[model samples]
Target: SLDQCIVNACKNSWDKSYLAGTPNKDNASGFVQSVAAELGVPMPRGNANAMVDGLEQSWTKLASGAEAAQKAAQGFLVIAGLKGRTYGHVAVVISGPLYRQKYPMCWCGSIAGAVGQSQGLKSVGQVWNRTDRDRLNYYVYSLASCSLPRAS
Candidate 1:
């Protein structure tokens, strides 16, 4: 069951791409929907909050409750309402010490006012310590086999 779920999530988006400013909530909702459908899991109706929570619970259970660790190695976290803000955003955790720096968030947005300006990788070690987890929001999905291209 877990294998199917993971595979479905990955295959559905392996080559599919998107750009920033494409409505974070809507984009994230679509992602959650696809993953839920692939995993044969039912998604909650209405609102991004409920959808994100459902996604988190599903992935958390599949990851053996190691939400932070699973994300640290190769998973992703989808979150809404950062720093008490209303609008939602999604970010990935690049690294962490589990409870020490758990759920460290990373994303490159609005750099130089350009769309997807490529903020490059922002390691958790750079932005967060241990106490910042509560200040951020997100969901974690494993991308262990995903790769990137080398710049020339």
Candidate 2:
């Protein structure tokens, strides 16, 4: 299944030690971009803020709300949370139930905030707080669209 494949890719690629707090090296955007590439759909050069707005022709922007959370809980969805004009955050949706009917379970390669510790997979609320709800944007990509062999 694509969900498990994505989980494999993320587990194989995401290195929290190097990815955490390393800007211009191995931060959220870079981590997500690499994950996209590993999944065979490389996103264009951009930060989380830019990528969140649909700079990649291969990615599809999703409408906010239950529909977005539903697709995310399945697979192939990337959650981009806006922080400001220049910086933001990105994470790959793995597998889990929706949180309060909004945020989905996902994993990011960055430092955990006051919500918890460990950079492992968790619901969006664990990484981001309620104040960030409106700033988040969801995007989906198709593995078949990229012509890459699905991971086992």
Candidate 3:
């Protein structure tokens, strides 16, 4: 499931996009935003209150209260969140085997708040791409615009 990345970030809005990543350089937030951009949602900013406040509003809210998975995905988007510096990304996994599950560990010096981090640091395995819904901070399935490429 994509949510394994920044399951938390996926649940946040563009304003809070910065809070999408793990602490330090090991950043997954940018990666999540990448997924969003690839999916046509594009978050385009957060950590702390200032960061999220400066984030660019790229997408819209779900028109109706329904699972986006009913249309495009299965688990969730686990999006990278919004940050132009770390824009354009996607771990596309619509149905079967993970598509671009080879992401997550990133430095992404795109944000000033990430200055003191370890520099694209991360803690996980090569196959760390799954998340429990109860622990998900952000779920792409919450989106209303999700139209899976395969149309599953």
Candidate 4:
């Protein structure tokens, strides 16, 4: 399945994958982080925490609402909430016009649906639904331009 592709892609290629090959030695890293790294994109590096939260702030921040999603382009990250978590439950935009469910998570798991996370591409809900506007409040990183990295 595609879900496993992201998971296996990073896990299997962790040693030589993104984020300096990810915190993969122990699978304690994340998808957003790993995906961004492998894709040669920008993100955070929280080696101390392992999750590397809030790396999206660097990208364009569209206004609230579905219309805002349109501003985003393909290859943009549909990211949301940490560690080993797509760097916080994020996904890559494979193809889209940037509407609702315009994107999909690169990888997630069963615990999501049980807890209500669901699964759009590999996780839950539509792009905007899963790529929350307020995971921990005041978040950014939607897709457009490459943002800079957060303080390590």
Q: What TM-score do all the candidates reach, one by one?
A: 0.38, 0.69, 0.28, 0.39
Q: Once superposed on the true structure, which residue ranges of model 1 sit more than 4 Å away at CA?
A: 1-8, 14-26, 52-67, 70-85, 90-101, 104-133, 136-152
Model 1: how large is the Cα RMSD against the reference?
8.8
Clashes of 3: 23
Q: What is the Cα-based lDDT of residue 133 in candidate 2?
A: 62
> How big is the positional error of residue 85 in model 4, measured in Å on the Cα after superposition?
14
Q: Best candidate per lDDT, number?
A: 2
lDDT, each prediction: 0.37, 0.58, 0.31, 0.36
Candidate order by decreasing lDDT: 2, 1, 4, 3
Candidate number achieving the greatest TM-score relative to the actual structure: 2
**Model with the higher TM-score, candidate 1 or 4:** 4
Candidate 2: tens digits of C-alpha lDDT, residues 40-73: 7757576666766654445666776455555644
Question: Candidate 4 at residue 71, lDDT?
Answer: 28
Model 4, span 47-112: residue lDDT tens: 413333444345443333232233222223434333333333333322223234433233322223
Over all chains combined, what TM-score does candidate 3 have?
0.28
Q: Give the lDDT of residue 128 in candidate 2.
A: 65
Clashes of 4: 12
lDDT of 3 by residue, 1-152 (tens): 43333333333322333344443223344434444554455453533222222332332222211222222234444322222333322222222222244223322323334332212243111222344111212124345443334545
lDDT of 1 at 81: 20
